[PDB]
Amino acid sequence: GDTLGDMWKARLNSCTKEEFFAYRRAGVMETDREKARELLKRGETNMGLAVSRGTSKLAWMEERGYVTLKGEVVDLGCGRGGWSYYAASRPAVMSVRAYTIGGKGHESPRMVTSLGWNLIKFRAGMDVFSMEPHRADAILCDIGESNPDAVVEGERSRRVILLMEQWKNRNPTATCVFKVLAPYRPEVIEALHRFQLQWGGGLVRTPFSRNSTHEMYFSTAITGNIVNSVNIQSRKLLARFGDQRGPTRVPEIDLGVGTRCV
Numbered sequence: 502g503d504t505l506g507d508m509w510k511a512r513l514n515s516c517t518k519e520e521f522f523a524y525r526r527a528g529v530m531e532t533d534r535e536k537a538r539e540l541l542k543r544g545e546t547n548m549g550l551a552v553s554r555g556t557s558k559l560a561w562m563e564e565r566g567y568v569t570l571k572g573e574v575v576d577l578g579c580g581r582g583g584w585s586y587y588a589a590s591r592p593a594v595m596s597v598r599a600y601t602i603g604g605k606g607h608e609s610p611r612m613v614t615s616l617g618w619n620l621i622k623f624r625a626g627m628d629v630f631s632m633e634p635h636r637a638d639a640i641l642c643d644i645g646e647s648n649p650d651a652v653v654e655g656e657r658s659r660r661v662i663l664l665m666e667q668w669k670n671r672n673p674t675a676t677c678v679f680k681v682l683a684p685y686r687p688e689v690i691e692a693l694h695r696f697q698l699q700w701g702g703g704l705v706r707t708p709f710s711r712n713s714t715h716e717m718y719f720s721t722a723i724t725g726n727i728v729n730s731v732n733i734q735s736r737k738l739l740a741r742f743g744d745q746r747g748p749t750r751v752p753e754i755d756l757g758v759g760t761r762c763v
C-alpha cells in the first residue's frame with residue numbers, strides 16, 4: 502500500500518522487540534489495572550472496576566458526547582463485556598444485548614455485579630457476522646483482531662463495516678459506534694465513505710489506543726472528513742517513533758456495583 506498508514510505498519514513490523522516495547526505506549530494514556538486484575542484473578546463478583554481496558558475507551562467517547570447511549574443497546578463482540586457493563590451503568594440505557602463467540606481461545610463475558618449488570622443479556626457462542634439483526638436503539642461493535650499483515654486487518658475492518666450496514670438497515674435511526682482496525686486501507690476507506698454518505702458520522706482516536714494500533718472509532722454522532730482524519734492519525738503515529746515519553750497513567754474507571762430496575 503502507498504499510504505502513510507502503510508508506512509507506519511512497515512515501520513512497526515520492522516521494530517526490534519526493545520523498539521516495539523519502547524514505542525507502543527509512548528505518550529499513550531493507560532488505566533492503572535493492578536487492582537482490577539487482582540479482583541479478576543480472585544474471581545470477585547462484587548466489583549465495579551472495569552473488566553477490561555475497553556470500558557474507559559467507550560467512557561471517553563460518551564463523556565465527550567461522541568456517543569450518547571440510550572434505550573436498547575446491542576454490543577456485537579462483547580468479549581469480557583467492558584462496553585456492555587459501561588452501557589448498563591448509564592441511566593438512559595434500558596437493556597443491553599451482548600454477543601460474543603467466547604469459549605477457549607476468545608474472551609468470555611466476566612460475570613460481575615457492576616452497576617446495572619442485571620440489564621445485560623449475555624449470549625456467548627454467537628457468531629455476529631452470521632446472526633440476523635434485530636431491533637436496537639444503539640449498535641456497538643468493538644471487533645477487529647490485530648495482525649502483522651495489514652491486508653488481513655483491512656479485510657477484518659471491511660467485514661465489520663458490512664455488519665454495521667446490515668444492522669443500520671434494520672435500525673435506520675439507531676446510533677452506531679464501531680472499531681475500524683485499519684482505516685488507512687483503500688477498501689476500508691471506500692466502505693467508510695459509503696457508510697458516512699448514507700448514515701453520517703466520522704472517526705475519532707481515543708488516547709488509550711496504543712501506538713501499535715491504528716484503530717479508530719466511527720460514530721454516527723460526530724462528523725469530519727474521513728481521509729483527512731485517517732492521514733492525520735497516520736502522521737501522528739509516524740511522529741511517535743522515537744518519542745521518549747512513557748505512558749500517561751490514569752486511574753481505572755469504577756462504575757460502582759448493584760442492580761437497577763427498569
Ligand SMILES: Nc1ncnc2c1ncn2[C@@H]1O[C@H](CSCC[C@H](N)C(=O)O)[C@@H](O)[C@H]1O
Binds near residue numbers: 552577582583601627
Ligand atoms: N465473529 C464474531 N462473533 C462474535 N464475537 C466475535 C467475533 N469475532 C471476534 N469476536 C469477539 O469480539 C471481541 C472484541 S474485544 C472488545 C473489547 C470489549 N469491547 C470490552 O470492552 O471488553 C473479542 O472478545 C472476540 O472474541
